[PDB]
Every structure is written in structure tokens, then in C-alpha cells.
Structure 1
Amino acid sequence: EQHDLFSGTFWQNPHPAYAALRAEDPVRKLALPDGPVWLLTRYADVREAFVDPRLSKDWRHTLPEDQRADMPATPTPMMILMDPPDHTRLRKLVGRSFTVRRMNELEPRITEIADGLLAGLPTDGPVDLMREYAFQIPVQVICELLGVPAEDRDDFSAWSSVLVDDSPADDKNAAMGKLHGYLSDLLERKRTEPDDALLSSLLAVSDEDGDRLSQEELVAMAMLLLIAGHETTVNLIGNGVLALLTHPDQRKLLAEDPSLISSAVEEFLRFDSPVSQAPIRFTAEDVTYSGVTIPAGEMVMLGLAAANRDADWMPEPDRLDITRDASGGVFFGHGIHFCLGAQLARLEGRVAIGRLFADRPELALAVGLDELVYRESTLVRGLSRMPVTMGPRSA
């Protein structure tokens, strides 16, 4: 029978809806509030679509040919909203700074951030694990990555939460201006006073033809990292913790062998992908997937959460198996826009989740599954809150 889509029963558990879509309606127009968008749910179609040159990030394909003259490529020069060759240049410049060592160097800091939060949580609560733990880690990590002065952090975090929906969308519109101004000035302090962190690194960036990020590009890139790395990581933590709380068997396996945490994080990303659909693509011309044709100029979402449970890709896809092999999941995307932060996200997930279950072996949900409340956000699989009882700290 007809499962609700992006409404009703869908928000608490969209997986049955996605399974029915993959089986019966794999390429489907969705009447979303701000406008209709097409959804692809089969793994093979999603994978193809990510490398389909006819599926663009350039919103100007929504305009008929005669209306394009005046029009800018992007509303903000963010690399995620570009096609090659412009994307290729920004990806080359920023990518330089995302070194293996920079990631390894962050691990002790992420560990300290997690331990600091864990220390302040009570044994008997109940406590909202989202507000109190998952929400805090990723922005504190972004602060560390970028080199936001520790005095400016609680302020930085404050305006960051405003971007992750506190009140109406009037304030975010100006919170961007605050973060833009703040980052703009910080970049100046880094220029005068180089440090080992990312903002400083991004200024040095210079290819042999002398190329470098403009002042405008630098701030847009920093804002992109904040936005791309905050809510996403929060939901990796929230969703992975929930997966363990709801699968006693897998939780036992991890407890007996803590080294499974890396494999576990890959499986959480597959089993309940936090970026549930990829951000919109635009058809540059008509495309046909699973015999269904999407006209030129349309908006298209790639169903990552749906694709990651496609049995044509992964056998027993509805089973959580933290020993499973990750291979080929689409939770970080695929092709040219593949998540720049994937290594950092994976690090944050394994520290946040691994340390929590190590610190609090008797952690338990304090409500029934049917009582969990998810954010009604098209591209997000995210708990609004997670009531838990932390239980005693491990011996």
C-alpha cells in the first residue's frame, strides 16, 4: 500500500518507503513544499547519476536558453555548487590542505573534546544525547580544524547552531553575515600570524602559475566546511549510537572487540545514511533512468539512504552487520564532489561513538523507538533529540 513520502510516517522510519520506491517507483517526482524534485532510489542509478555529465550543479539549467545572459554561476562561490572546470580548480586548491597528517593531528583534539563532554554527563538523567553530545562535537572539531581562537568558540558555536535551525530563517540569513565577517577578519589574523591550522594553510595555497584562493573564495570555502561538516557529522553520531542501542548483538560484538569501530562506522553510514539524499542536481538535458525520463531543467535528488540498502548491491541490506564490508556505499557521494571531509567525518564518528560506548557501557534509550522524533528536513536523517540514561562510567 502507499507509504507516506517526506510526510507522515516517513520521518520516523523512511526505510520501508525507500524499499517500495526501489521496487515499484525508482524514479519518482516528489511534490515537496518549495517545489517538485525527482528522486532516484536504486543503487545502480544513483551511482550512474553521480557521474552523469548531464546532471549539473549549475542552477541556470532551470532557465530556458533565452533567459541565461545575466546569470551568475553560483549565489556564493561554493565549490559544491559548481561544475568543472571551475569546480576542478577549487577542489585542487582546497584539497592540498586536507592532508593525512592534518587529520591524524586532529585525533587527540577530537578525543579531548569528546572526553570533556562525557565527563560532564550524569549517570541517571535522562539526558538528550543530541543536544548534550552529538550537537557539540562537530562544531568544536571545525573550530579546531580551522584555528578559531578558543575565546571565539562559544560565540562561533552559538551562531553555528542558528544555521542549524533554532528559530526562523530570517536569523540564519544574518548569522551568515556574522560568520562571514568573523571569518573574513580571522583570515587577516592568520595572514599576519601563520599557524598550523586550516585557514592559515588555505592562504598559502598557490599552484605553479601562482594561482590561489581569492579573499571571497577563502571565506566561501570556510563557510562551506562549517555547513557541510556540522549537521552531517552530528547525525552520523546520533544515527550510529541509535543503531547500537537498537541492536544488542552488534553492540556486544563491538564491546568484545573495540577495534571493530572503524568497520562499525562504515556500516552505520550505510544502514542509516545521515545525508539521506544528495543535494540537488539539475538536468542539463533529458535523462532516462530505469526507463523513466526526467525532462531538461528539472531538479534531481539522489537517494543515498535508499541506495545504501539496495539488495541488488548489498545482500541482507536491512541487517546491521558491523563486520560487513563497507565497499561502494554512496553515503559520502561518488565522483568529483565526493565528500572532502570523509576522513575527518570517519575520525569524528569513531572517536565520538567509540569513546561513548567505552565510557558508558550501560547506555540505554530512555524512550521507545516509536517515540523518537526526527527532523523534517528533506536531505537529512537526523534525530531532533535522543532521550537516554547514560548509566555508570566504566570501571
Structure 2
Amino acid sequence: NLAPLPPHVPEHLVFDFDMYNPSNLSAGVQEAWAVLQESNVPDLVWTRCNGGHWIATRGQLIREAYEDYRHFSSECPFIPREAGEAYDFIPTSMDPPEQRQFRALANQVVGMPVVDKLENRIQELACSLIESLRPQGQCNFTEDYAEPFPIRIFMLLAGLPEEDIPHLKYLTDQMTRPDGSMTFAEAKEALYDYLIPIIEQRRQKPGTDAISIVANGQVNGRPITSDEAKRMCGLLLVGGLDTVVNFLSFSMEFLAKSPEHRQELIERPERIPAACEELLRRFSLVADGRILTSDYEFHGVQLKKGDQILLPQMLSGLDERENAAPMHVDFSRQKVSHTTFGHGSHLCAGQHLARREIIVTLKEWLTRIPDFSIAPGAQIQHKSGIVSGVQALPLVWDPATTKAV
């Protein structure tokens, strides 16, 4: 379904990419998005899919647009417009200077100091999960580890009951990769309906959990409001439930298929943090955007006030102008350039948590299950959206070749 071309959009800039179902998805979702970087596609294009919006395809343009909040506002950051309009999460729906007091609170709850405190718990949950799985010689990685590991950590941090995960996880996914069963707004309001009473409970009798801390936070010489607390906690949930979860699967699918890269990390565990960064570049997975606050000419293209522009975080590290042989995974890549965690004032507040979760997974998995592969003949299917994902990841291994810790 192609929305008719706006008058200011030249025909030669039309490239009808569908971010929710790209044509070459079978090849892998990063491969599919990478068609935007083939020689036939201009650096900045208009797609008529999903209501009609711009797409920047190059690292340099993506970075520039993310720095320039004056022209490119976060107020409406999702495609389609209906989602972007309904999107009211804090701090990401705000531009500076208003954004700044809230970002600092968010940093306080999921930032590095909190990760440092959680190190042992992170280690423990990973080891316990992996030790439980090891004697099986098989798992569906997405549901047996990729989901429970970072989600149980977040749920613990947020002080929310684990029994609520299936319901909460379902709703989160409707905001990033919708079933078609709910609109973005329904899912958001459902999440909000869950949060509202808890936030009230924790303003009256605060705890030490992340939600108590947000709800009782100080921003700008005043306490956060109940509704502001609600909008920040909703975003923290989504970050906790639908980011690392998907990334781990892209990484493990790759490792399962490439024993040499596994052996590299097994024999040289000191290369794991470097590997994690390269994996973050190659299997980048997030794409949101901004909305034009005024008419603006950007790299020779006129944008009209109210135009939406998708600025795919995924695309920067896959840009050959940024990394030679971008689809090639090289753990000793001299300069790993990417914007997987974003760019400008909205750069991911949870990046340290993500990195810790990844590096711990890489270390403890390869230690206990050094040798594994994708199940015989099984076809790996990726899913595309605001955050991309892996639908299923069946793995098999000989437990004899596995090592108990």
C-alpha cells in the first residue's frame, strides 16, 4: 500500500522500502535493510510504504540528523505516524532542553553504577540458565535463554513479578513488531494500565527498586509527576524486554554457524569485549526516526515541516563508507564504527547493561557449551520493525563436548 507522492518529493528519490516487511528478509534482516545501501539507492530516499516517509541510508546523514534536534524532533519518533504520534515515552519523546532532566534520572536507574551493583546477579542468572540447558543437548534459544536472561534481570531490577512476563512481553512486542492484533496505542495504554497502580503504590511506600526510584525521582528542583513517572517506566520496560533479547539471538545464530569465531573467543577470552562491539555493529537491529519541525533542505533534498524521516541506527555500521567489507565479521577489526545504541542526546541510557549482558552470555555460554550448531536443516527466520528480531533459534549440541562449571 503506497501513499501517494507528496508534491515536494522528486520521483527519482522514490524507493519503496517497507521497514516492517522488507523484500529480502529471507537473506537475514541486516542483509534486507542493506539493500538501501546498494548502488541503485540514493543516500536519502522517500518510501510510500507505511504512510510515506524519508529514509537516510548513510552513517554520516544519520549522525547529522540525530545531532540536529532543532530540525529533527523526537516528539514523533516512530513510523507509522499514528505510532509516532501516540508515542509519548520519556525521555525519548522529548527534545532538549526539556529532555535533559529526565535523561539524568533515567541514567540514575539503569546506568553504569546500577550495572556495577548487578554484576554478580547477572553472572548468576546466566550461569544458572546455561547449566540448566547444557545437559539437554538442545534448546530454542530465543525462548529458552535470549528472553528469560535479560528479562528476568530487568524484572528483578524493576521489582516486578516474573509471572507477568508473558503478558508484558507480548504488549512490548506490539509496539516494535506488531502482530496486527493491536495498534501501537492499545498496547501502550495496556502497559500504562499495568504501571499506573504500581507507580501509585511506590510513591506512597517507596522501595529500592527501579520503579520506586523513577516514581520518587527529582527532576529540575521538583518531583517527577505520576504521569511523567508512568511514561518513563513504560520506556524502561520496553528497553528491558525487547532489545538485548533480540540482539542475543542474532549473535548466537552467527556463532552457531561459525566455529572459527567461537574458537577465537574460547581461546582468547580477552577479545570478547572487542568481539561484542563488532557483533553490535554487524547485527545492529534498531531503527526509529524523527519529525521535521520546519521546512529544511538537508543534503540537497527539501524536507517539509511535518515530514517523518527514518534514521536507521542499524544502517550506520553497515555503511561501507564507515566500515570496509561491512557484512564480514572480524573480531580484530581495526576501527569498529557504529551507532547501534543511537547518537546525539538520546544515545541509549541502558548501553552498559546491554554490553554486560552480552559479554556475560558470550563468556559463560562458550565456556559450558563451546560446540553447538543450528538444528539440522532448520531455517532461521528474522522479523523486522522498530527493533528487529529472530523468530526462532533451535540449537543442538553434544553435551559430552560440553563442560560443567
How do 1:118-137 residues align onto structure 2 when only pairs under 5 Å count? Answer: 118-121=130-133, 123=135, 126-137=138-149
Q: What do the CA deviations read for 1:143-186 (whole angstroms, capped 9, x no partner)?
A: 122222xxx22224433234325965349866655543443333
How do 1:365-384 residues align onto structure 2 when only pairs under 5 Å count? Answer: 365-368=374-377, 371-375=379-383, 377-384=384-391
Matched, 1:143 2:160: no
Deviation at 1:103, TM superposition (A): 0.9
Q: What do the CA deviations read for 1:213-267 (whole angstroms, capped 9, x no partner)?
A: 1111112111101112321111210111122223332211101012322211111
SS of aligned partner of 1:185: helix
- Segment drifting more, 263-272 vs 246-255: 246-255
How do 1:280-299 residues align onto structure 2 when only pairs under 5 Å count? Answer: 280-299=289-308
Contact 2:172–2:241 under 8 Å retained in 1: no
Task: Name the CA shift for 1:178/1:19 in 2 (closer, same or farther; >3 Å).
Answer: closer
Residue identity opposite 1:366 in structure 2: A
Residue identity opposite 2:45 in structure 1: R
- Segment drifting more, 73-82 vs 108-117: 73-82
SS of aligned partner of 2:52: strand
How do 1:239-318 residues align onto structure 2 when only pairs under 5 Å count? Answer: 239-275=250-286, 277=287, 279-318=288-327
Distance in 2 between the 1:91 and 1:143 partners?
A: 21
Matched, 1:35 2:65: no
Task: Name the CA shift for 1:111/1:385 in 2 (closer, same or farther; >3 Å).
Answer: same
Distance in 2 between the 1:239 and 1:100 partners?
A: 24
SS of aligned partner of 1:385: coil
Task: Name the CA shift for 1:204/1:325 in 2 (closer, same or farther; >3 Å).
Answer: farther
Task: Name the CA shift for 1:17/1:58 in 2 (closer, same or farther; >3 Å).
Answer: closer
Q: What do the CA deviations read for 1:102-159 (whole angstroms, capped 9, x no partner)?
A: 11111222222223322332645643111111122222121122222xxx22224433
Contact 2:86–2:185 under 8 Å retained in 1: no
SS of aligned partner of 2:255: helix
Task: Name the CA shift for 1:8/1:177 in 2 (closer, same or farther; >3 Å).
Answer: closer
How do 1:56-135 residues align onto structure 2 when only pairs under 5 Å count? Answer: 56-59=73-76, 76-121=88-133, 123=135, 126-135=138-147
Structure 2 residue ranges without an equivalent (≥5)? 1-14
Distance in 2 between the 1:74 and 1:372 partners?
A: 33
Residue of structure 2 in register with 1:8 after alignment: 23
Distance in 2 between the 1:37 and 1:293 partners?
A: 13
Matched, 1:235 2:246: yes
Task: Name the CA shift for 1:332/1:22 in 2 (closer, same or farther; >3 Å).
Answer: farther
Contact 2:140–2:392 under 8 Å retained in 1: yes
Distance in 2 between the 1:74 and 1:259 partners?
A: 44
SS of aligned partner of 1:226: helix
- Segment drifting more, 37-46 vs 281-290: 281-290
Distance in 2 between the 1:77 and 1:253 partners?
A: 41
Which of 347, 351, 359 is the aligned partner of 2:368?
A: 359
Which of 379, 387, 393 is the aligned partner of 1:386?
A: 393
Quick one: percent identity of the two aligned structures?
25
